[PDB]
Amino acid sequence: SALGKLQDVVNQNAQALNTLVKQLSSNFGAISSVLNDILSRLDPPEAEV
Amino acid sequence: ASVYAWNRKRISNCVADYSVLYNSASFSTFKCYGVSPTKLNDLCFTNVYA
């Protein structure tokens, strides 16, 4: 338990990166969270929406 | 059939060709939600309801 001041530094970075990665599975209002389905499912005029 | 007794047909095990449906001119309303009609050919679905 002595090295906590050094361990939390690693923990914070590891949590921040994990949270950044988890944000790719969000729709943000779109119809799908993966960019390939939108391109393979919608016409070019309305994919940009 | 009637509105309150609407039929439902199960569609499965198909080489589904929607080009003939698209090229027909007998339909006054041709509207699709979330799928481009020209792109229906390549896509694969687990089941289709009619």
From Swiss-Prot, chain B:
Provide the effect of residue 21 to I: In strain: Omicron/XBB.1.5, Omicron/EG.5.1
Write out the function statement from the record.
Answer: Attaches the virion to the cell membrane by interacting with host receptor, initiating the infection. The major receptor is host ACE2. When S2/S2' has been cleaved, binding to the receptor triggers direct fusion at the cell membrane. When S2/S2' has not been cleaved, binding to the receptor results in internalization of the virus by endocytosis using host TFRC and GRM2 and leading to fusion of the virion membrane with the host endosomal membrane. Alternatively, may use NRP1/NRP2 and integrin as entry receptors.
What's the subunit arrangement here? Answer: Binds to host ACE2. RBD also interacts with the N-linked glycan on 'Asn-90' of ACE2. Cleavage of S generates a polybasic C-terminal sequence on S1 that binds to host Neuropilin-1 (NRP1) and Neuropilin-2 (NRP2) receptors. Interacts with host integrin alpha-5/beta-1 (ITGA5:ITGB1) and with ACE2 in complex with integrin alpha-5/beta-1 (ITGA5:ITGB1). May interact via cytoplasmic c-terminus with M protein. May interact (via N-terminus) with host bilirubin and biliverdin, thereby preventing antibody binding to the SARS-CoV-2 spike NTD via an allosteric mechanism.
Q: Per the record, what is the consequence of mutating residue 24 to F?
A: In strain: Omicron/BA.2, Omicron/BA.2.12.1, Omicron/BA.2.75, Omicron/BA.4, Omicron/BA.5, Omicron/BQ.1.1, Omicron/XBB.1.5, Omicron/EG.5.1
Q: Which domain of life is it from?
A: Viruses
Name listed for the protein in its UniProt record: Spike protein S1
Q: What is the effect of changing residue 29 to A?
A: In strain: Omicron/BA.2, Omicron/BA.2.12.1, Omicron/BA.4, Omicron/BA.5, Omicron/BQ.1.1, Omicron/XBB.1.5, Omicron/EG.5.1
